[PDB]
């Protein structure tokens, strides 16, 4: 049952739409596609409250990135939140 990932994004709060959107806007400032740079997610995690490595952060990105285009969309961005809260246990 992987409906929990979509169920949360369907009834999420405005704080979530602004929490990630804040970093999303700064990272997607010079971009015109609608996605941040997965490789530059190190600056995102640090802002979120985590300071991992470039090899470790890339792993969690590819995991949340359903397509794995090397870019995190707002949908993939907010997903990472629920993915950490609930996914295994
Ligand atoms: Ca993607």
XYZ file of C-alpha atoms and ligand atoms in Angstrom:
90
model
C 0.000 0.000 0.000
C 1.774 3.118 -1.302
C -1.350 5.318 -1.222
C -0.109 7.062 1.964
C 2.439 9.073 -0.068
C -0.349 10.482 -2.269
C -2.913 10.688 0.557
C -0.662 13.077 2.520
C 0.083 15.319 -0.474
C -3.683 15.390 -1.162
C -4.451 16.688 2.361
C -1.165 18.395 3.316
C -0.894 21.785 5.041
C -0.021 25.184 3.577
C 3.110 25.202 5.765
C 4.398 22.235 3.727
C 3.623 24.004 0.430
C 5.729 26.947 1.680
C 8.430 25.101 3.666
C 9.868 23.348 0.604
C 8.693 26.022 -1.868
C 10.980 28.507 -0.069
C 14.116 26.497 -0.876
C 12.520 25.403 -4.160
C 12.232 29.048 -5.292
C 15.847 29.966 -4.429
C 17.225 26.803 -6.095
C 14.848 27.124 -9.082
C 15.636 30.840 -9.471
C 17.876 30.616 -12.548
C 15.915 27.573 -13.814
C 12.849 27.703 -16.070
C 11.643 24.084 -15.909
C 10.008 23.784 -12.468
C 12.518 21.586 -10.619
C 15.580 22.001 -8.388
C 19.017 20.466 -8.956
C 19.277 17.078 -7.205
C 23.082 17.423 -7.245
C 22.641 20.790 -5.477
C 20.209 19.314 -2.911
C 23.074 19.430 -0.367
C 22.138 23.089 0.206
C 18.502 21.997 0.645
C 19.141 19.327 3.275
C 21.309 21.797 5.221
C 18.384 24.244 5.185
C 15.922 21.469 6.123
C 18.071 20.544 9.154
C 20.468 17.830 7.867
C 24.106 17.967 6.725
C 24.824 14.729 4.756
C 27.381 13.985 2.016
C 27.143 14.306 -1.819
C 27.176 10.508 -2.177
C 24.541 10.011 0.551
C 22.216 12.882 -0.437
C 22.213 11.665 -4.065
C 20.941 8.248 -2.917
C 17.867 9.627 -1.111
C 17.210 11.913 -4.103
C 17.221 9.094 -6.672
C 14.960 7.136 -4.292
C 12.321 9.898 -4.024
C 12.772 10.824 -7.712
C 10.351 8.433 -9.453
C 11.831 9.357 -12.851
C 15.374 10.158 -11.668
C 15.871 13.055 -14.086
C 18.484 14.666 -11.791
C 15.882 17.267 -10.762
C 13.447 17.427 -7.838
C 9.992 18.763 -8.685
C 7.737 20.348 -6.048
C 5.781 17.068 -5.958
C 9.000 15.079 -5.421
C 10.180 17.791 -2.993
C 7.164 17.550 -0.662
C 7.098 13.754 -1.089
C 10.551 13.473 0.530
C 8.908 14.904 3.689
C 6.231 12.197 4.008
C 8.785 9.612 2.805
C 10.875 10.318 5.920
C 7.880 10.455 8.287
C 6.298 7.230 7.003
C 7.494 4.647 4.465
C 8.881 1.584 6.284
C 7.500 1.612 9.839
Ca 12.452 13.937 -11.349
